[PDB]
Subunit: 71 residues, 3 copies
């Protein structure tokens, strides 16, 4: 969502730089901050999914042990 | 795969810009579009994994409830 | 972790470029390599989570089949 917002802002600045290529240095630097923010927002979500996978591993392990124990 | 293809294209343009640093503004702008596409392709896959984690959570919850109910 | 290290290095180069904007072309090119490395490191971790989700799917499927078979 914010990633989607940062991507659209980067898409906008990309069009401005390509049109300005056709002042440009500032937009190029700003575009690099746009991409860095996007990468950082994706890192946050990626970090959440890593933790979500670990919790699913713990849940399935508990079920596997429960079935083992019931035997 | 496409991410891998976008990364290699970015790796190629990176070498051209570093060699051209040693016309450059256009390549720098094109490289920024290469990275934006890569970020967007990774966002698509990241979005798929978020949905895949939610479906695994629903599957393990159904198993957990089944075992609870059988008792 | 390395992603976090590549992000901080990109954050440092971003500040230098914004201050140098206020030689800049080289830093802009170097910053683009900083972001490319970050994207590539995130792709590696993203690839690991895709594989981790597939293994969790196989584990829950085995549990689902076990419970089906016991009936």
């Amino acid at each position: 969502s914010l990633i989607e917002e940062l991507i659209r802002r980067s898409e906008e600045q990309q069009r401005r730089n390509e049109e300005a290529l056709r002042q440009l240095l500032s937009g190029i630097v700003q575009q690099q901050n746009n991409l860095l923010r996007a990468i950082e927002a994706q890192q946050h979500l990626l970090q959440l999914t890593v933790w979500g996978i670990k919790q699913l591993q713990a849940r399935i392990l508990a079920v596997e042990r429960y079935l083992k124990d019931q035997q």
